[PDB]
Subunit: 214 residues, 2 copies
Amino acid sequence: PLTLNFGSVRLPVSADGLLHAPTAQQQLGLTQSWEAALVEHGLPETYRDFGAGPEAAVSVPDFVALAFALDTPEARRWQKRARELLARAMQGDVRVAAQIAERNPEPDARRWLAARLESTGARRELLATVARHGGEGRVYGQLGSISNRTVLGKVKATRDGLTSAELLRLAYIDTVTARAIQESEARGNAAILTLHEQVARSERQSWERAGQVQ
Amino acid sequence: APLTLNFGSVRLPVSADGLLHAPTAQQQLGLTQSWEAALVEHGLPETYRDFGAGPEAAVSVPDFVALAFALDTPEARRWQKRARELLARAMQGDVRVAAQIAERNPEPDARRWLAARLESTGARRELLATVARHGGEGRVYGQLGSISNRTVLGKDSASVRQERGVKATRDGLTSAELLRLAYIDTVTARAIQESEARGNAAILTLHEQVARSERQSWERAGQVQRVG
C-alpha cells in the first residue's frame, strides 16, 4: 500500500505511479460519478491494486488537468499550490527541493541528488577559481565540454542525464583542476584549459588501466 | 556583473535580490502596453534594479506568476502550463526538478543545508555489493575501508579520530575528503566489474592501486612531495 504524501494529503498510488481515483475525487471535490467524469474530462478507464482489489486509477498529470478544469474550493487549493510552487521553484527555495526529494519512493533517487549537488558544488568552485585566474568568454563552456567528453567517453542540463557514478567522477575532476589552478597560479584560458584537460586525461587513463583483465 | 534566472529554456535577467527585468517579463507574458500602463492596470509595485545596463523597471517572481495567471495571452498560457507540468513532477518527487531549484539558489549554505538533509551518494554501498558479487566476504569490507582511509587521511581511522577529537570519523572529514573517498569507492566498483576480479585478495590489490592512484592525483595537483 504505497502513498504520495503531498503535505497533509496522503494520496494512495499504484506501482506505476497512478492515483486512486476515489481519493482523487474527494481531494478535488468531484461528487460526479467517476464513469461520468472519465467521459466529460476525456480520461481513460483503468484499474490498479491499492489493497481492496482492483479500483479506478488516474495519472498525476490527468489529476492536475482536473484540478485546473474544475472550480470547487478543493480544485482551487490545488491551483493555488501550483502557483506558489512555480513562484518558489523560480526563487530557488531549497525547502521545496527537500520536500520534493523526500516525496520520491526510491531512496536511490535522493542518492542521485547528493551526487548531482556535489557536481554543482565542484563546478561552482572551479568557475569561481577560473574567474579569479583571468578566465574569460568561452572558457566556462570549454571546461564543461572536456569534463563531459572524459566521463561520458564521447553541461548543467547534460548532468541531469548522467548517473550518480558519472557525476562523482565529474565532481572529482573539477575539484582537482581547481586545486591545480590554485597551486600553479596558472593564468588565462589557454593555460587553464591545458591544465583541466591534463587532469581529465590522467583520471580516464587511470580508470582504463585499473579495468584491464589481469 | 549580469545575473540570469534559468527556468528550463527561459533565461530571465535577475537582480541580486531576485527581482525580474520587467521588459523581458513583458514579452514573456505577451504584455503589449508600456510597463507604466501595466503597473496601474494590475496594481504592481514601481521597482528599479541595475541588471547590468543601469536603472530599469523590475517585477518580483510572485508578481510575475500572478500576472501569468491573470493574463490570457498565448505567452501567459505557456507559463500556466509550466506550473501544471511542475506540480505533476513535484507530486512524483522528481529529483531532477529538486536539483534545478537548488541550483537556482546561489547561497552556498542553502546547498549545504539541503545536501545535509539528503542521504549519501551510495558509492560505499555499491562497492560492498560488487565485492560480494565477485566472491568476497570477511573483514575484506573493513579492509577496503582501512586501505582508503590510509591513502586519503594519511593514517588509520582511529589515528584520525584522536588527532581531530571526533567519536565517528565522518564528523571529522572535510567536503574534499568525503568526495575523494566516494570517488575511490566509485572507481574501484567499475574496475572490479571490468577486470572481472574474483576473491578477497584480487579485490583488495585493485582497491590499493586505485586509492594510491587517487592520492598521487591529489598530491600532484597540490605539487606535494610526500615522504613515505
